[PDB]
Amino acid sequence: DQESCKGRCTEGFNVDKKCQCDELCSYYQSCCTDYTAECKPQVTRGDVFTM
Fold this sequence. Notes:
- 0% of the residues lie in helices and 0% in strands.
């Protein structure tokens, strides 16, 4: 999204997995190899979205 219109932004990419890598979730915990499909808390991990 922020880097380029991808992930949550469908328009500027293809295969609409809304966690792709960056987006925002990268910083807000992680998306990139952390969340699977969408940019949303899936796993707690420990940091940021603490359980």
